[PDB]
Amino acid sequence: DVKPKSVSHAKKWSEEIENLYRFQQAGYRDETEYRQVKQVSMVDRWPETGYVKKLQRRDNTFYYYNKQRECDDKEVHKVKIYAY
Amino acid sequence: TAFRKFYERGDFPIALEHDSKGNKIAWKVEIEKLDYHHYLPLFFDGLCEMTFPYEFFARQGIHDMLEHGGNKILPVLPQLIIPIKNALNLRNRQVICVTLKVLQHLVVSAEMVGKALVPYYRQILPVLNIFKNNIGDLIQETLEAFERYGGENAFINIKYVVPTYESCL
Helix, strand or coil: CCCCCEEEECCCCCHHHHHHHHHHHCCCCCHHHHHHHCCCCCCCECCCCCCECEEECCCCCEEECCCCCCCCHHHHCCCEEEEC | CHHHHHCCCCCCCEECCCCCCCCCCEECCCHHHCCHHHHHHHHHHHHHCCCHHHHHHHHHHHHHHHHHHHHHCHHHHHHHHHHHHHHHHCCCHHHHHHHHHHHHHHHHCCCCHHHHCHHHHHHHCCHHHHHCCCHHHHHHHHHHHHHHCCCCCHHHHHHHHCCCCCCCC
């Protein structure tokens, strides 16, 4: 029941925005909700880039994410940024 | 010893060098840029460390990250409860004192951390009964910090787990 206070939308891409994109693609606000919802030891990330590699969705299917950036410039504005 | 593996790993974000001029630690990376979801729990996993090189970089590491974490600390609080519990459950007096000072720092490091800690009192507070009376007064001082920054539900939840607790302020 640690929940964010407020939500804004991204305006330029970032490493943070990329990982937020990948969490929200799989249906989680961020790693805080994803670890709340799922029993998580580690979040599997790419070695060189740190980006999220795979996520188990709410229906227990999995999303896989590319080593390189996936959030194109058109999508940046749709990523939600949550403050705690 | 997940910290011992973290230590001297590649991702370890502190430079392993000692400058004569003090006991500051040199960060290879800026604290602001670290993913606290990954780093802060690893540093808290060092609360169990007592051997010389490790314990220093664990404690000073926790100190700086809490002092400069800001709004990065609250979203990570759930991931710290197991490391806090494990350190305290060693029933080592020195690990418990270091952890208590850290818990004091935790609940003042950022807004709402103290309140968000209340649901976990029953997971971390029990050991302190053994040592409830210098560790006794540090437990008392820590519990007052918890209650002071814990919101309206803090005392009742401190008392459920610490029946002998009492505090005016």
